[PDB]
Amino acid sequence: NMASLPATHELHIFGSINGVDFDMVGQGTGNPNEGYEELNLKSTKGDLQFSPWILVPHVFHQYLPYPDGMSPFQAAMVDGSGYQVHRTMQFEDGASLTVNYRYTYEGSHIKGEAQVKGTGFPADGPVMTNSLTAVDSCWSKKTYPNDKTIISTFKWSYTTGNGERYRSTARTTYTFAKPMAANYLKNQPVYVFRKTELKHSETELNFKEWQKAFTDVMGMDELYK
């Protein structure tokens, strides 16, 4: 018997921000019945030369349960066929950031690879000058346009060192190797509430996340934003 939800994970998150290369690796844990995950990361390329906050929320929906059972992400892991993830973020100042994810599974252990490319950050904005201080909690909205796709959308805000909000919008595409169960396509959309904590230096990140999915939710349209 090999049927397993995740208990542990590791992330290799790498790429560039405004052409500057970064690379971080580390181990983490979570509880796939509660939606909790935490992750340690260490840089393999010296001091991050940009706000470490730009890697949140990108630093494993395999830990997210749904209101009534496994999420489609968990079902894809357990079945073994899995899924791929593409995220785009559009920032208020015209900057753009993409992340592509691939996973492999060794029983209850996940190996994540996340490739990041951020461009168009103003040279003196809060990202390149390292003056982001916090994130807002966040609702995501998950839709299923077909049986192999989930589209997720969210508004995102960082706090800056002057106490302003620095805003973006995010679109995430999930591609499933096997069709999702009919029940998922019927009980949509799904809203997920997420809270995060980040402790960081120049070279190290300690990330935590709490998340909970909500189904059958009326007039959530202008409130999740």
Author numbering: 9 to 67, 71 to 236
Quoted from the paper:
In addition to obtaining the structure of NeonCyan0.95 at physiological pH, we also obtained the structure of NeonCyan0.95 at an acidic pH (estimated to be ~5.6) which is below the apparent pKa of NeonCyan1 (6.4). The most notable differences between two structures are the different configurations of the chromophore, which is in a Z,Z configuration at physiological pH and Z,E configuration at acidic pH, the presence of a sulfate ion bound in close proximity to the chromophore at acidic pH, and a partial deformation of β-strands 10 and 11. Absorbance spectra of the NeonCyan1 variants in the presence and absence of sulfate ion, at pH 4 and 7.4, did not reveal any substantial effect on the absorption profile. Relative to the Z,Z chromophore stereoisomer in NeonCyan0.95 at pH 7.5, the chromophore of NeonCyan0.95 at pH 5.6 was revealed to be flipped to the Z,E stereoisomer. At acidic pH, the distance to the nitrogen atom of the imidazolinone ring has increased to 3.34 +/− 0.16 Å, which indicates a weaker hydrogen bond and may even be consistent with Glu222 being deprotonated. Associated with this weaker interaction is an outward movement of β-strand 11, which contains Glu220, and β-strand 10. This conformational change may help to sterically accommodate the Z,E stereoisomer of the chromophore. Similarly, the crystal structure of NeonCyan0.95 at pH 5.6 revealed that the chromophore is in the Z,E configuration. This observation supports the conclusion that the NeonCyan1 structure can accommodate the Z,E stereoisomer.
